[PDB]
Symmetry: C3
Subunit: 440 residues, 3 copies
Amino acid sequence: QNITEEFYQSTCSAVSKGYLSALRTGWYTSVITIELSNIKGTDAKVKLIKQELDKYKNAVTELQLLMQSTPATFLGFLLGVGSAIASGVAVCKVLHLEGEVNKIKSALLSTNKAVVSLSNGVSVLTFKVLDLKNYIDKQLLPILNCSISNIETVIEFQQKNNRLLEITREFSVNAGVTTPVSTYMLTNSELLSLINDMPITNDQKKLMSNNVQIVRQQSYSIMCIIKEEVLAYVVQLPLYGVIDTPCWKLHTSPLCTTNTKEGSNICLTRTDRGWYCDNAGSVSFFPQAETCKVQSNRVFCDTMNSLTLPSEVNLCNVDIFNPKYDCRIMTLKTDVSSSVITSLGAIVSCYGKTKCTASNKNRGIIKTFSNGCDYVSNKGVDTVSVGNTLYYVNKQEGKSLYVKGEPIINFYDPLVFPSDEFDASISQVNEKINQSLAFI
Amino acid sequence: QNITEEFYQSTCSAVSKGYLSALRTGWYTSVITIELSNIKCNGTDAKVKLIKQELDKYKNAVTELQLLMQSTPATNNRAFLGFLLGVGSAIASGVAVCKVLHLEGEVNKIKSALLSTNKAVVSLSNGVSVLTFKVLDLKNYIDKQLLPILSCSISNIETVIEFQQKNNRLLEITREFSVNAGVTTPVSTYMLTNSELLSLINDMPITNDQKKLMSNNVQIVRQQSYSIMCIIKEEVLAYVVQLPLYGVIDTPCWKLHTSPLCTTNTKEGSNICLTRTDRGWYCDNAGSVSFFPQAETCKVQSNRVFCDTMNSLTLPSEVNLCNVDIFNPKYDCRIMTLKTDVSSSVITSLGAIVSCYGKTKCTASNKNRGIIKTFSNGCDYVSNKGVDTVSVGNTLYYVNKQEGKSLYVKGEPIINFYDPLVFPSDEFDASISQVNEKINQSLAFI
Amino acid sequence: QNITEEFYQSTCSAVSKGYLSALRTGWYTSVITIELSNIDAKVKLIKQELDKYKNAVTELQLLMQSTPATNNRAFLGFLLGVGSAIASGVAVCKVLHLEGEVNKIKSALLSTNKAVVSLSNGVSVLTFKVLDLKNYIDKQLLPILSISNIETVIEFQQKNNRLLEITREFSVNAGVTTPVSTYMLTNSELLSLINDMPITNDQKKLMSNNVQIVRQQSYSIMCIIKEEVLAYVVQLPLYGVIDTPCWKLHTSPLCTTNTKEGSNICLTRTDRGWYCDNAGSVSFFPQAETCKVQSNRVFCDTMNSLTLPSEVNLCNVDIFNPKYDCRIMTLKTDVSSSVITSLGAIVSCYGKTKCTASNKNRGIIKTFSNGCDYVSNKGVDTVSVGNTLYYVNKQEGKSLYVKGEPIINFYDPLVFPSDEFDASISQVNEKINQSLAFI
Ligand SMILES: *[C@@H]1O[C@H](CO[C@@H]2O[C@@H](C)[C@@H](O)[C@@H](O)[C@@H]2O)[C@@H](O[C@@H]2O[C@H](CO)[C@@H](O)[C@H](O)[C@H]2NC(C)=O)[C@H](O)[C@H]1NC(C)=O
């Protein structure tokens, strides 16, 4: 779409706008099931099937060993704390009630996909993706009560047993909870049909179908129960209750004075960088922008990694001194040079004797940054160098706008400025400055 | 057991108690071995063609493990309170065994003891009595079933399929070591199968309590174990499986949940906050308390907690008084004073702490009935009894449906005891006494 | 090599020197290709195994639907910059979507498996054909469309395995994997990829002798499925800085040891990590876990570094020097800990903690008193601090103990600014002159 950026010279920050939201807000719990079999002149083929049957016994013995265990799994320190799989573990706990697997075992008699009402009222979508009991009771039990010369029986059993062996492996090195959800746990044809039957909007169906590889990354596979010849595990799928609302990304870098004595210098950095998305009259703020996933101009975030802020937080980009929101800063003296590759350019904080440049593949250096905080758009720029570090800029097409302004750090007297404030605000600094002045 | 929770309204914190400890204090290093075959025909059919392809994989796997072993095993070393932790190598005990196996005649000592059996106890030259395992004998299979066929031909397809099955474990063990620089964790079923691990545990020189504990929680043992690629020499592939030893068992553990405690005045610039910074796992250990500040390093199975003491701080047992009397003179309880006047929730073991500030909508809902509690400004708590979800702003939290009793300890929020005009806001890691000292200075200035 | 250590008693820090640098400064992008085919009981196995190939290709098309995506940001690790590691390899992915660009590779990989192709953007890439499924399916599986030659089923199973496995790795990694697996690039393919690479023989010898490190620092980016070609990019590191001196700085908290633990003040150097000489400056790596050590060589990615003046080294010799403002923090961290260094251990013992250094067979050989001290690994096997047991490195090297007055003793506890998350020697002196002027 129309991706645009604004660099604010006054605050050493940039906003990339034009994105669309797809926020994980809820969970959908489904029960995936695998129908198991309960079973007990020696040539080579009977030996091979006993070897392949030993694996089936080993995997079943191991999954019972996992089922022994009740399932367990800048401003980010302000976030809350919650259990990601608490919604799926509660469903798993229900499946441990007597007759509850028997309800699923019974409802999955005439079909593979079914909606089952549990004792707690959760309407779950149950799946039978593999029937090993049918294969063992039809093709392998009569041939063992000890001679077969159809080698295709060995390969067919190897192929049919393979998915079970691998699902068991994934659960073994992951304490019974896996993420992302592999194609062994749930193939694409199973996932796409699971989406079509999901109690979601047609917009959410189209969104999840065109972005299945994100659904996998945001989903959990929880090993649940082995009981009554049934292997059941829970797949916890994302619900995107917020879709196509505006998102924007805020990039910040340190803003420092460039005086000759580096000990008479003070710094200032906006701490509110991350993803911002309009959401229900407020703004969902994602302080660790690494937890969000971007597909073109769509951004996938999980609300568990967010803060719900007033919409007035956006005024901090236009007027960081506005009275409506107390914009958050830090005053640690971070007089080292760095760069931040934005959506359509690069913020460069250049301090000291550092060589900071932006170059082109064939043309050469096209901008040399002086001390302070500056910005260059990706137009004609291929890389950015800061000291010995080379950064590649994004070659995405979009318009950058440079908002000239006086660096706000110049408005402060270094002799009273409270350096080393890990997390403060415009008002806390002003409060601390007025106190230190009254002592004079 | 009986897991219980206490919410302390005065400090906006909760303690989940009733747990039993299983803290890693030692290591057991075992040597896993695979006896290799030393191998060096034009006229072929299709079955020998498949065996030639599968034999190229065996050669490539051996060639790669030799390339990986070229590098002495390597680790990535350092130099809420996690920056306070120490720095040590987790696999240092297993690397010492690898160093011994590179001594001349040391691999041959293992080769001899695993000649007539698959499991054996070997005393190394450094005095370590290791439990050695021969989990795969490709030398016997290749020299008996594949060497005579090597101008050459066979039409027995069952040898091709059996060879693919026997060679697979080597190929998968090799893959895991290649994408993990020779050190893997957790230990996979290829590195050590479930039946081999259970028998390895049964022969281990430990008490029956630890045997029953490790046996009933093998999938935890895997995650807390390391597989260290060691040596290929004299037709032997050897790697070390480093297993945890739980020297602290069945001592009391409890989890501390904290959330910001702020004043709820109308003007958001007159509001001050306070948060207990000591959250994490606490376990009684040897007259002290092992404190695990990164509560992600501990793994909980029902009412048992598995932690690694390498990720702990050793505190006096008086640190527990901070939950009863945060102003006690015996321990200086640690708080922070950053003005964190945003709403958030903390999902505990048996409930939810809700810090609601400003204009944020904080509610607690039921499975199907909907909102059953609306939180007002301040710090409150709801039990998981009858509650399924918690909403704070646009964030929906699911509570844990574990069964246990919650106890609400009513008390005056201690943030109300401070004058906002002298309160030292923005203290990243301070204590009750450090704050009190800073207030007397700003008051003595009047 | 000759690893040496110095412990500075005055600042509770130790420097391990003698290492050699190998710093990632550039990237080599190569295009790996897989030529695809467009399409009783024994055919049942062939139909099932053929469905896997169709589904795997169907999935890669579903994965390729998404231009590769990254998780970018917006002790001092928060001071680092922000950049995309795979941006150079993503540029190749963008080129391969241009018309006629795949056919250029398809043409160059007609008579051989390895070829150098000049792309439309001017990048001379080394292209590889590691699997030809088009040949197998159009020659052995198209004519059967029954056959009861079971060796055809197994041969297809063996040839299809790598494709299915490459698809799996991309599915649980959003199309970008690291390290690069043997499926993405086998060891013989990587060794030959290095040998045909336009680099010096020294870097070839370096990369060849440390391939499992090259894998960890390399990325595999899924690119395109088009015109019967599956193409992905393997992004390999180039080490532009080699054999310059590196050293590691270990720090631990330095506190006073008075009787009342509330009259005690602490001080910790925050500049711990890896330091390597680089282009007249010093590349500083604050999270030393991002570096990988092989014997005495240090492999780091400059994307995780800060470029500091070379005078930063004076902080180890004279922390009060005027040339560099040495960085400290003053949080009251009066808990005991140990730091295992290259040749010894730093021990910060405070309060009532039992801190000892023991031998395997001899027992306790040193008991640490309150404060910050050091023991060399010579004759020492373990260190105990409270309930935590640390193993020392048994590496051979000499440690040098630099005796000095702990600098925390130079401060008046009544004016010392405790709770400074990241300050410096001069910032602390500045705050004390102010707090004294108020008296
Ligand atoms: C500004 O303050 C510094 C630091 O003084 C410190 O705080 C004092 C209250 C006391 O605790 C000192 O021990 C601390 O050093 C002054 O530098 C000190 O100067 C005195 C001179 O007698 C010397 O003994 C100290 O060692 C110095 N401090 C250090 C860390 O070396 C400085 O003189 C003050 N004034 C100015 C203008 O900088």
